[model samples]
Target chain A: AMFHYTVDVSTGMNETIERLEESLKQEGFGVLWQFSVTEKLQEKGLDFSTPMVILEVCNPQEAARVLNENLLVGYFLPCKLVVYQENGTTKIGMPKPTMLVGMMNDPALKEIAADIEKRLAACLDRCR
Target chain B: AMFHYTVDVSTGMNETIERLEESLKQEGFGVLWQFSVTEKLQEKGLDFSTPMVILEVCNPQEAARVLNENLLVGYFLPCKLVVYQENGTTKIGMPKPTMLVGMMNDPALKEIAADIEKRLAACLDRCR
Candidate 1:
């Protein structure tokens, strides 16, 4: 199975997203955008929803290197983290950039993906 | 090693996203977020940038059924689409969710992944 990491965080959405940004900076990542999917869906008159905020983040150096490795990687660029709730459970997690890179089948990038994966997982660890 | 689908479109960003949303509805998906990475980057003092719009979307039935199949799937849930300008060319595409599902190694869900993959690829096809 592909390696993806999720962490349970007790903090509410706003505080968790805020603290996660600060933690990301320590690993050279910065928040690119933050928005409420719950609110957005509610606005669309779409019922049946959950509270979740998406954080699109990037480490410019890592992003540049990966895109340079393959421009199509841009499709998966600027890693995304979801701070969400499920049936009263609080959680935060992200799709592994390494997992995405692996799909591209480039052995040269395996190390870069592993590093970015470790660093972002570290960022999620501190959000709690 | 895995298949990802992307298509370059001839329309401007706004119109492209609008039409893409309309098209996605034909497949039961709805847009949850549409925002500019360029503007968000400027706010963070990140200089270099590209004009790109992020679309986080979901078909409730598809999302619910899939999440039930595997909770970790939430990490990649509500699939993402990016419409952007690259080297002066307009483009719109998304990672193939089937690829992620494939990583999970559950043969039981392969048909589900293949079906969703085809539908979403058709959605991208209409963005032009």
Candidate 2:
């Protein structure tokens, strides 16, 4: 699963993030967790910076099914969604479900992967 | 390679992102692109909100090698870094290269994956 998309704009990061959240929701996903890499380092006594954010998103129904098939898969549960600023532009990324889940080597997971990939791609495409 | 880390700080997103940028630089990586899903939706006339960011990070030397090995790999080039807001917290994410590249079934790429994973994990770990 190879996931890729880009947004080229000159806008404030806060506004960009707001738009991303809305798009993800429209695609039937909810954010479960978020991490800010920029702030963390400042507290660690570091300098030099770029804006980076991470979002853990889940489609409740799919998560439930995957958990039932292999509870241990929870170790890799909650697909990741990301937003970061670089070179005066903001970008978003999500894993390619096809690649991320291929390791399970489970034939049954093919459909699950396809569905997840399609949904995630929709989220990315909608981010335009 | 598997990568995992988190940041639990009560600070501004801008500060956190700045810190992360420094950490990635210390570890020998550069931001190639950034995408913000938040703002795009506004332009599309959609609503529903959350904060999400995506960073396309690249270790030039490694990227060059990977590209040389398989130009098509450019399709999967630039590791992702993300920051998102959820439940009043900001989170960061990057693909677990171990699971992501397992499909290539190339043992040689293992070292490359491990190296990249280590660096990315460092960036995350240092976030706080």
Candidate 3:
């Protein structure tokens, strides 16, 4: 199984991420936190130049549903998406939710994961 | 690549986690946040019976080093460890840093990841 879903888009990093957050919000998910990888590294004198950001998102009801079904799902909590630049091309992606939940071998969690994967991908699609 | 490192120990859930946190601290890592899966689920009336907790940890310099090398590293930020109970036996585990960094295919990040993986795995060994 593919571990991640990535799509190339025509836009700058910040604009891509802005659209992503807006799309996620429209899908009943809220962005809880975001990390600016490029700026953070530069602050520490790392000299890294790639524009990248990581966003943590959650839908309260969906989070509760998965936690109730399997504790291991907590290891992958809140869900995460990344927007970054590669050779001047912008890309947005995330690890597949089904792949994470698949580790548990529980049918119930897998079902929840599929629903989440579809919803999240839809959000990414809107960004592109 | 094997995605995680898990070890079984003869202790209660809380004690194992306490020792794990201490070990991480001694190795220059700090726990940034912790989530109690069982308690949170119970509050929502999910009836989750197993005890499980996830901890997010990081060493500032190391984080900067990895992020400076590859932005994708942020997708696995802060690193995480989980302590949980099953059939009265305690388990401490984490997704291997090497496996996460391996996704980047950057040699520099792999070197940093190997060191982090060794140190983190050593912490789990001490708990066992």
Candidate 4:
């Protein structure tokens, strides 16, 4: 699997997140799932501190095709994104799609991974 | 609280994630958690398809401070990063800290969120 990309921004976390959402839209992706780690942890009775959010993003057509090609791939569907505080700072990170698909040993999926990576990169570039 | 940032790279997803992780280290952050959504789903008997990964990153010192101040924050602790494919493209995204914290309505935590944002932005700038 591919490792995740981490980014630090010099702005309010909310502002940055908003910009990111907008950027994703420009790239033709949408946020499908969002998990608040803080709320989840509190519900689980785990005592910890930090600000973190997990976002599951997807592009409709790509998802449908992948599922049709390989049912097992669904386990890896709906990519994720996170934001949290560390050392008085908040950092963001995400996994690389190609790397993640590489583990499946399916060379056919490479093209799909490449396309997703391109759009995601463009989104980040615009964010800056 | 914060929206996620997404980036797509022309290069390999693995290469981009590597660079992102390296950049994050330069900002004094560490990858503490890595989740393979594809693998996890397969293990659970869910049949879907996509290439996605979730990474949990944190700064040891900052994590400790936040947990001390608000044990509940632990749920939200350890930021996240994701890479996935869409429309034959692979993309990456992560949440913004300030926005995530803003949801809690804790005005005092804004400074901490801002600091985290700065470092995350720096990391992204360096990645390009």
- Fraction of true contacts retained by every candidate, in order, equals 0.28, 0.02, 0.34, 0.06
lDDT of 4 by residue, A5-41 (tens): 5677665567767887898887767876665665655
- Top candidate by lDDT: 3
Report, for all candidates in order, the number of backbone clashes: 0, 38, 0, 56
Runs with alpha carbons beyond 4 Å of true place in candidate 1: A8-18, A32-54, A84-91, B12-14, B36-52, B85-89
Q: Provide TM-scores for the models.
A: 0.75, 0.52, 0.75, 0.48
What value does DockQ give for candidate 4?
0.05
**Tens-digit lDDT string for candidate 2 (A1-128):** 23333455445567666777787799777876566654544445555266766666766666656644543344344676667776778777665665555555666775677788788777766666
Write the residue-wise lDDT of candidate 1 on A1-128 in tens digits.
Answer: 44667898888777788789889998988876676656755665655366877787888777656655665676676688888887777789887887778877788886788888988988888876
Docking class of 4: incorrect
Q: Of models 1 and 2, which has the larger DockQ? A: 1
Q: What is the TM-score of chain A in candidate 4?
A: 0.84
What DockQ does each listed candidate score?
Answer: 0.30, 0.05, 0.36, 0.05
Error of 1 at A40 (Å): 8.0
The model with the greatest DockQ is: 3
Q: Write the per-residue lDDT of candidate 4 for residues B51-77, one digit (tens) a residue.
A: 666666766666555656654344345
B1-128 per-residue lDDT for model 2 (tens digits): 33334456454566767777888999888775555544434444455245555676766567655534433333344566766666777766665665455555656665677677877888887886
